[PDB]
């Protein structure tokens, strides 16, 4: 729940200069400027994610995300990165092997697939 | 500041605020007032007169001129870029055809006049005939409007001097710079046919009228820094650079380095990485584009730095480098590579010498290849060419095709064959190793020179302001290790500006240029208007501060006042824009009429000492108004207040000498006949002698008619009132409904567009097949 918004947040920050990988750790830096293009559906998904946060009893984290959403600046993005990192420290989820496996092998196979696509693949 | 903040400021500039008129500009309104007979008796019928909508004119002639400067500012704010009168149209409820009029205020006047019982039937007939006419063939529409003549003049100027022009696909295509269209490496396409009723607004791309490149060194430094940041932002990034590890290993093999010394190497290999190569590419192209001076940073112990500097001075005109750094680099090259190669004694070069080290070496060197390369480096300069109306700095055609790289190579080869008579063999070996490292990549160097030139000219096609070549206050530091990295790591991958990148760069330049010109126009208009309105107590520093703040790339906290006043002086010599100038001409023509319409101030007071009959004016009855100051000596109240010398006025008041005190004054409207008989109007001037102040002066205006409490005296004694004082003031103009009807004409409808290049889809050919000006591929190495 807490880590979900990040997948959208990265798409809301404009690039004002960036790094470019060359060979395995080597970075050449660009002054390129890129504006963040975000459709309304993505904003609806982010709203749904914050609603899910609040439905689970979260008040401070969604409020922080909403406050950051006023400007969507990279200078205040460290708080978003902080929330993202903190989400993973609530421990592991060592559920039973049966439930975890059944979740993994939960398949809905169909004969109604695109034969052309599968043959090309 | 951080470069990112500067880039954000530059890329946040919008094209221009587009103004639409929603209501007709109006200084006047009709107002119904009671009228009185020639004997002062009230009539049963009122009359409509023209009055100021917002009567807020101040006291004092200077303050009135200030008010009119403020009015000029307001009108310029209300001046629209385009106008469609169908938006202003409202229903005329008394129209026979149920037609429309503009604006809603006209409809309000029409309703008030029609519903009034005192309205002549001809006026009601006329109101019934008021309707709009649509000519869809010409895309025109005419609407009736009720306007004061000054209001009509202003609105007519707005209607007839709009800024929108027809837009079509050909205009959109020609909006692209001609050199981008001429380039065969870009394919341009459209998917829309713009309608015949489409409109657009041309940016004001006039060249710099302030000439900030001349003697405004700090402002020019700021401008050049902004241009440099923008150019860096748009310069493409190098790709498929030779692997730094692989190239370092190859260079170690060529140098026969001792094992494990690659990390510690400082004569050839230090500072070689892809980041430095990309930074060198960006720095060179951006500095040339923005015409920003460059500073060379190097360590004389690094021979590779000197050989890369030889290449750099071959390809980049030497005027692009600050003199001291160029001199140091040339001296290192001469004393480390050339003179020791030819056995010449080390050059003892004097700091401040009129000649560069290469200029001396060219005379002193007998080898033809080395001397020829030295001469070319000495004389390699930009060419100032006006292309498509923009001044540009063009590289030599031999640089553009990479041919100079051969000349340099020849010199280098001749240096590799020399004996170095005075040096140990290891010195010759080191120089040969450096030359070998550079010359193992001769084809790559030719390709890199051609790529630099092509990217430079392609991005130069997108510049809209003149490329003025002048040394800047500060420099951009270029490390020669970055040049070495660029030389040693550049691959065979052709990187050229993306068409969308070119369009964005051109749009940013256009927006900056248009903002510059529009703020120049605003400042010039305000300064010229203030000068023509004789606002001698006005300090124009605020105007220049607003101008610089709206330029949005200068921090005014670092701009002293003398520089701002120099900017004011330069702006003061520029002509005013045609629209602003015509608006100010209208205001100058009509300001006397606007001021005399005020009911809050009078134009003066005539202090005579004889009985002058009160004038008959239907909207006043009997009133002690003077239509003109004829036959009276005039004392200017503004001059009296400015100088503070009350000797003349005191002498005239003590000696009962008839005079006229001229200037915007407030007055007391007293309707009492007993007050007039008591001669109170003559009692309001002693305070001038008492206190030597005229700002408190408030002449009495008598308004004697049947509404006066003691008007029977006028009626029962066949007596025409007389007064010894008069108020220099005008009477309101009657509102004639028929004479105030004007058919305002506009276009029925059109659509205005802002970003023309949004309609252009542009692609690049495969970079392997991208060609240069000479019709050959930019890069041919394989």
Q: Please list, in sequence order, all residues whose beta carbon lies within 8 angstroms of the beta carbon of residue B427, skipping any fewer than 6 positions away.
A: B340, B420
Q: Please list, in sequence order, all residues whose beta carbon lies within 8 angstroms of the beta carbon of residue B659, skipping any fewer than 6 positions away.
A: B606, B607, B632, B633, B634, B635, B649, B652
Alpha helices, DSSP H, located in B50-142: 61-78, 85-88, 104-115, 121-128
Q: Where are the beta strands (DSSP E) in chain A?
A: 15-21, 27-34
A32 interface with B at CB cutoff 8 Å:
yes
Tokens encoding B514? 């248009």
Inter-chain CB pairs, A–B, below 8 Å: 49
**For the sheet containing B133-135, what is the strand order?**
B133-135, B140-146, B741-747
Q: Are B387 and B458 in contact (CB under 8 A)?
A: no
How many whole angstroms separate alpha carbon B505 and alpha carbon B302? 37
A24 interface with B at CB cutoff 8 Å:
no
Sign of the C-alpha dihedral, residues B672, B674, B677, B681?
negative
3-state SS assignment for residue B543: helix
Q: Please list, in sequence order, all residues whose beta carbon lies within 8 angstroms of the beta carbon of residue B329, skipping any fewer than 6 positions away.
A: B296, B298, B306, B309, B313, B321, B480
How many whole angstroms separate alpha carbon B52 and alpha carbon B94? 26
Backbone angles phi, psi at B53, to 5 degrees: -60, -45
Do B273 and A26 make contact, defined as CB atoms within 8 angstroms?
yes
3-state SS assignment for residue B670: strand
In 3D, which of B404, B249, B225, B222 has the Cα closest to residue B313? B404
Strand-pair category, B186-189 with B383-387: unpaired
Do B279 and A28 make contact, defined as CB atoms within 8 angstroms?
yes
* CB-closest option in B7, B235, B273 to A33: B7
Do B244 and A20 make contact, defined as CB atoms within 8 angstroms?
no
Do A31 and B244 make contact, defined as CB atoms within 8 angstroms?
no
How many whole angstroms separate alpha carbon B685 and alpha carbon B670? 17
Identify the closest residue of chain B to A33 by CA–CA distance: B233
- Tell me how close the Cα of B540 comes to any Cα of chain A, in angstroms: 37
Q: Are B200 and B168 in contact (CB under 8 A)?
A: no
Do A28 and B233 make contact, defined as CB atoms within 8 angstroms?
no
Q: Are B82 and B198 in contact (CB under 8 A)?
A: no
In the block, residue with structure tokens 């094209």? B15
DSSP assignment of B217-286, as one string? HHHHHHHHHHHHHHHHHHSPPP-SPPPHHHHHHHHHHHHTPPTT-TTT--SSSTT-SHHHHHHHHHHHHH
Using a CB-CB cut-off of 8 Å, the residues of chain A touching B282 are 31
In 3D, which of B597, B615, B634 has the Cα closest to residue B733? B597
- Tell me how close the Cα of B296 comes to any Cα of chain A, in angstroms: 21
Tokens encoding B680? 């109170």
DSSP symbol at B681: G
In the block, residue with structure tokens 């049963």? B44
Identify the closest residue of chain A to B501 by CA–CA distance: A32
Q: Are B459 and B227 in contact (CB under 8 A)?
A: no
A29 interface with B at CB cutoff 8 Å:
yes
Identify the closest residue of chain A to B486 by CA–CA distance: A28
Do B274 and A32 make contact, defined as CB atoms within 8 angstroms?
no
> Could you tell me which CATH number the domain at A1-12+38-95 has?
1.10.10.1990
3-state SS assignment for residue A91: coil
Do A32 and B3 make contact, defined as CB atoms within 8 angstroms?
no
Buried b (16+ CB within 10 A) or exposed e, B177-209: bebbeebebbeeeeeeebeeebbbbebbeeebb
Strand-pair category, B700-704 with B668-670: parallel
How many whole angstroms separate alpha carbon B616 and alpha carbon B623? 7
DSSP assignment of B720-746, as one string? --EEEEEEE-PPPPB--TTTTEEEEEE
Using a CB-CB cut-off of 8 Å, the residues of chain B touching A33 are 7-8, 11, 233
* CB-closest option in A23, A28, A33 to B233: A33
In 3D, which of B137, B203, B234 has the Cα closest to residue B460? B234
Do B279 and A29 make contact, defined as CB atoms within 8 angstroms?
yes
Using a CB-CB cut-off of 8 Å, the residues of chain B touching A26 are 244, 273-275
- Tell me how close the Cα of A5 comes to any Cα of chain B, in angstroms: 26
- Beta pairing partners, B100: B91
Determine the Cα angle at B486 with ends B480 and B490, to 5°.
165
Determine the Cα angle at B85 with ends B84 and B88, to 5°.
115
CA–CA distances in Å: residue B627 to residues A59, B15, B158, B466, B615: 76, 51, 33, 57, 10
How many whole angstroms separate alpha carbon A35 and alpha carbon B409? 44
A26 interface with B at CB cutoff 8 Å:
yes
Identify the H or E element spanning B50: strand B42-52
DSSP symbol at A5: T
Q: Where are the beta strands (DSSP E) in B380-464?
A: 383-387, 390-394
How many whole angstroms separate alpha carbon A78 and alpha carbon B536? 55
3-state SS assignment for residue B410: helix
- Tell me how close the Cα of A75 comes to any Cα of chain B, in angstroms: 12
Do B282 and A22 make contact, defined as CB atoms within 8 angstroms?
no
| Residue in B1, B2, B4 to test binding to A, most A beta-carbons within 10 Å | B4
| Residue in A22, A25, A35 to test binding to B, most B beta-carbons within 10 Å | A22
Using a CB-CB cut-off of 8 Å, the residues of chain B touching A37 are none
How many whole angstroms separate alpha carbon A55 and alpha carbon A49? 10
Rg (CA), chain A: 20
- Torsion over CA of B59, B65, B67 and B71, rounded to 10 degrees? 150
Do A20 and B229 make contact, defined as CB atoms within 8 angstroms?
no
In 3D, which of A66, A74, A61, A14 has the Cα closest to residue A43? A66
Do A32 and B282 make contact, defined as CB atoms within 8 angstroms?
no
Identify the closest residue of chain A to B229 by CA–CA distance: A31
Using a CB-CB cut-off of 8 Å, the residues of chain B touching A16 are 4, 7-8
Using a CB-CB cut-off of 8 Å, the residues of chain A touching B229 are 31
Q: Is B386 exposed, middle or buried (0-12, 13-18, 19+ CB in 10 A)?
A: exposed
A60 interface with B at CB cutoff 8 Å:
no
- Tell me how close the Cα of B515 comes to any Cα of chain A, in angstroms: 21
CA–CA distances in Å: residue B214 to residues B574, B704, B757: 16, 67, 34
Q: Are B86 and B722 in contact (CB under 8 A)?
A: no
- Counting Cα atoms < 13 Å in the Cβ hemisphere of B450 gives 26
3-state SS assignment for residue B578: helix
- Torsion over CA of A11, A13, A14 and A16, rounded to 10 degrees? -130
Backbone angles phi, psi at B136, to 5 degrees: -65, -25
Distance of CA B224 to the CA centre of its chain: 17
Q: Are B225 and B473 in contact (CB under 8 A)?
A: no
Please state at what angle helix B274-290 crosses helix B480-489, rounded to 10 degrees. 110
Elucidation technique: cryo-EM
A18 interface with B at CB cutoff 8 Å:
no
In 3D, which of B152, B161, B14 has the Cα closest to residue B76? B161
How many whole angstroms separate alpha carbon B295 and alpha carbon B318? 11
Phi-psi region of B595 (alpha: psi -120 to 50; beta: other; left: phi over 0): alpha
- Tell me how close the Cα of B761 comes to any Cα of chain A, in angstroms: 18
A36 interface with B at CB cutoff 8 Å:
no
Q: Resolution, in Å, please?
A: 2.7
3-state SS assignment for residue B436: helix
Do B275 and A27 make contact, defined as CB atoms within 8 angstroms?
yes
Do B274 and A26 make contact, defined as CB atoms within 8 angstroms?
yes
How many whole angstroms separate alpha carbon B513 and alpha carbon B561? 25
């Amino acid at each position: 729940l807490v880590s979900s918004p990040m997948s959208i947040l990265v798409a809301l920050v404009d690039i004002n200069g960036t790094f470019i990988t060359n060979e395995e750790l080597e970075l050449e830096f660009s002054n390129k400027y890129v504006r963040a293009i975000v459709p309304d559906q993505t904003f609806d998904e982010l709203k749904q994610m914050l609603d899910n946060m609040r439905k689970a009893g979260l008040t401070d984290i969604p409020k922080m995300i909403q406050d950051w959403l006023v400007d969507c600046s990279i200078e205040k993005f460290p708080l978003m990165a902080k929330i993202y990192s903190w989400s993973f420290h609530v421990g592991f989820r060592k559920q039973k092997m049966l439930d975890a496996a059944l979740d993994q092998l939960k398949t809905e196979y169909t004969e109604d697939v695109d034969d052309e696509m599968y043959r090309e693949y | 500041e951080p470069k990112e903040s500067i880039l954000k400021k530059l890329e946040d500039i919008k094209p221009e605020q587009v103004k639409k008129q929603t209501k007709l500009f109006r200084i006047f309104e009709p107002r119904q007032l009671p009228v009185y007979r020639a004997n002062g008796e009230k009539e049963l019928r009122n009359r409509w007169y023209w009055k100021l909508k917002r009567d807020t004119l101040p006291d004092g002639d200077y303050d009135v001129r200030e008010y009119f400067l403020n009015l000029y500012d307001q009108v310029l704010t209300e001046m629209p870029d385009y106008l469609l009168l169908k938006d202003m149209a409202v229903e005329n409820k008394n129209s026979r055809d149920a037609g429309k009029v503009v604006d809603s205020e006209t409809a309000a006047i029409c309703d008030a006049i029609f519903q009034d019982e005192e309205t002549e039937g001809v006026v009601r007939r006329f109101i019934a005939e008021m309707r709009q006419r649509v000519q869809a063939d010409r895309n025109v529409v005419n609407y009736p409007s009720i306007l004061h003549p000054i209001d009509h003049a202003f609105n007519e100027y707005f209607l007839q001097h709009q800024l929108v022009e027809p837009l079509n696909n050909d205009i959109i295509f020609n909006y692209i710079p001609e050199r981008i269209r001429n380039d065969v490496n870009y394919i341009l396409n459209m998917d829309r046919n713009l309608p015949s009723t489409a409109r657009y607004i041309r940016p004001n791309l006039l060249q710099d009228r302030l000439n900030l490149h001349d003697n405004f060194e700090s402002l020019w430094d700021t401008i050049t820094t902004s241009n440099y940041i923008l150019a860096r932002s748009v310069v493409p990034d190098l790709k498929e650079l030779v692997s730094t590890e692989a190239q370092i290993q190859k260079m170690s093999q060529d140098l026969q380095l001792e094992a494990l010394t690659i990390q510690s190497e400082t004569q050839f290999l230090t500072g070689i990485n892809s980041q430095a190569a990309n930074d060198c590419f960006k720095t060179l192209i951006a500095a040339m584009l923005s015409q920003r001076t460059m500073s060379l940073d190097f360590v004389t112990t690094n021979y590779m730095s000197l050989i890369s500097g030889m290449w750099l001075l071959t390809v980049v005109p030497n005027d692009m480098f600050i003199r001291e750094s160029l001199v140091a680099c040339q001296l290192a090259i001469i004393n480390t590579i050339i003179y020791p190669a030819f056995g010449m004694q080390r050059m003892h070069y004097r700091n401040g010498d009129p000649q560069t080290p290469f200029q001396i070496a060219e005379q002193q060197i007998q080898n033809f290849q080395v001397a020829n390369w030295l001469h070319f480096v000495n004389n390699n300069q930009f060419r100032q060419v006006v292309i498509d109306g923009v001044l540009n700095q063009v590289l030599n055609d031999n640089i553009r095709n990479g041919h100079v790289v051969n000349q340099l190579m020849e010199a280098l080869m001749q240096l590799s064959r020399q004996q170095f008579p005075t040096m140990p063999v290891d010195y010759k070996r080191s120089i040969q190793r450096g030359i070998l490292l550079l010359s193992n990549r001769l084809g790559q160097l030719v390709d890199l020179t051609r790529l630099l030139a092509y990217n430079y000219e392609t991005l130069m096609a997108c510049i809209t302001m003149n490329m003025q070549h002048v040394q800047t206050l500060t420099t951009e530091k270029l490390q020669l290790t970055s040049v070495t990295s660029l030389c040693m790591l550049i691959g065979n991958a052709t990187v050229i500006p993306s068409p969308q990148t070119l369009f964005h760069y051109y749009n940013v330049n256009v927006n900056f240029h248009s903002n510059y010109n529009e703020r120049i126009n605003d400042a010039v208009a305000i300064i010229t208007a203030a000068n023509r309105l004789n606002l001698y107590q006005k300090k124009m520093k605020s105007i220049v501060e607003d101008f610089l703040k709206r330029l949005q790339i200068f921090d005014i906290s670092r701009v002293p006042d003398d520089q701002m006043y120099r900017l004011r002086d330069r702006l003061r010599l520029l002509p005013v824009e045609i629209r602003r100038l015509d608006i100010f001409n209208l205001i100058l023509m009509n300001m006397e009429q606007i001021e005399r319409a005020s009911d809050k101030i009078a134009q003066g007071v005539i202090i005579a000492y004889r009985d002058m009959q009160l004038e008959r004016d239907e909207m006043y009855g009997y009133v002690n108004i003077a239509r003109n100051l004829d036959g009276f000596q005039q004392i200017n109240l503004e001059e009296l207040m400015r100088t503070g010398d009350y000797a003349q006025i005191t002498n005239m008041l003590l000696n009962n000498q008839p005079v006229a005190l001229v200037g915007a004054l407030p007055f007391i409207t007293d309707s009492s006949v007993i007050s007039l008989v008591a001669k109170l109007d003559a009692t309001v001037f002693a305070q001038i002698v008492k206190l030597r102040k005229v700002d408190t002066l408030k002449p009495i205006l008598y308004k004697i008619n049947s509404d006066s409490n003691d008007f029977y005296l006028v009626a029962n004694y066949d007596w025409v009132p007389t007064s010894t004082t008069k108020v220099y003031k005008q009477i309101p103009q009657q509102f004639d409904f028929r004479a105030s009807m004007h058919m305002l004409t506009s276009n029925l409808t059109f659509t205005v567009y802002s970003d023309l290049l949004a309609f252009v889809s542009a692609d690049t050919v495969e970079p392997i097949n991208a060609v240069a000006f000479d019709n050959m591929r930019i890069m041919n190495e394989l």
